[PDB]
Design a protein around this ligand. Structure first.
Ligand SMILES: C[C@@H](c1ccc2nccn2c1)n1nnc2ncc(-c3cnn(C)c3)nc21
Length: 268
């Protein structure tokens, strides 16, 4: 059910709608549904289809789904069209003016998406507002995973010298920075940074810090500041997300409960 016949898909290669390190994203027509088509030519087949099957089994309103894969004599990843693009660029856009309730709602949507993924035992490893997207109905979808996974904004990835890996250090949990071990509990840390990103309308975290300098920074007893219009219990939620002990951080289930409680207190 993952494979799409070439006959069924029209790829508008002339107009590029996204740029990733592994390949570009183009406007697409799947037969008459509108879609986004990610190419991989900018870079195992058995693990590729396996990744596709897993991604298709994921069905939740706040998780970017897989429409399918097209095989051309590099394979094309077919994803639903996201009218408002990535969450970070949206909240950064001057033409849009989301309220504080709106921003909390966008965070609650990510938590709902992540609660779903964590229950399937799927660890994202690169959660950040730049890696979530919005469709026409303003539905946030946890994206940039499985076959859609890439480096969409290279500015926020530092290369480890002893490993050679591109790491999103300003979103990484303390243990991931020291041991390169990622779990659901480290995705929870990254969720706290996403919460901060939303409440500041896409400001870059720790502007005063330079790459792997971040580890000593956090070990000095430092955390991101409370943004101006961020409610006190929302900042309390973030602080819990950045707990030094992973096992002391809230689950995404707890996060859905606490954020929806904060969200219900706003009129509009
Ligand atoms: C494959 C790509 C994607 C998916 C759907 C879509 N509709 C319109 C454009 N689209 C791009 N994609 N999938 N997950 C992503 N996460 C993030 C980004 C992205 C692109 N630019 N920036 C800054 C982030 N792109 C992502």
């Amino acid at each position: 059910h993952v494979v799409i016949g070439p006959s069924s898909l029209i790829v508008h290669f002339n107009e590029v709608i996204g740029r990733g390190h592994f390949g570009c994203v183009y406007h697409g027509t799947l037969l008459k549904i509108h879609c986004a088509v990610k190419s991989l030519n900018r870079i195992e087949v058995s693990q590729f289809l396996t990744e596709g099957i897993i991604m298709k089994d994921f069905s939740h309103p706040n998780v970017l789904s897989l429409l399918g894969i097209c095989l051309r004599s590099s394979p094309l990843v077919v994803l639903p069209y996201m009218k408002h693009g990535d969450l970070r660029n949206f909240i950064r856009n001057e033409t849009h003016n989301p309220t504080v309730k709106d921003l909390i709602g966008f965070g609650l949507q990510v938590a709902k998406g992540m609660k779903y993924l964590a229950s399937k035992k799927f660890v994202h490893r690169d959660l950040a507002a730049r890696n979530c997207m919005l469709d026409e109905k303003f539905t946030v979808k946890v994206a940039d995973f499985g076959l859609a996974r890439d480096m969409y904004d290279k500015e926020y990835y530092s290369v480890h010298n002893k490993t050679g890996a591109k790491l999103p250090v300003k979103w990484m949990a303390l243990e991931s920075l020291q041991t390169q071990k990622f779990t659901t509990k480290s995705d929870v840390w990254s969720f706290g940074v996403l919460l901060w990103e939303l409440m500041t309308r896409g400001a870059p975290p720790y502007p005063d810090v330079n790459t792997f300098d971040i580890t000593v920074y956090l070990l000095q007893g430092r955390r991101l500041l409370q943004p101006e219009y961020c409610p006190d219990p929302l900042y309390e939620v973030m602080l819990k997300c950045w707990h030094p002990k992973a096992e002391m951080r809230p689950s995404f289930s707890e996060l859905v409960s606490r954020i929806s409680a904060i969200f219900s207190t706003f009129i509009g």
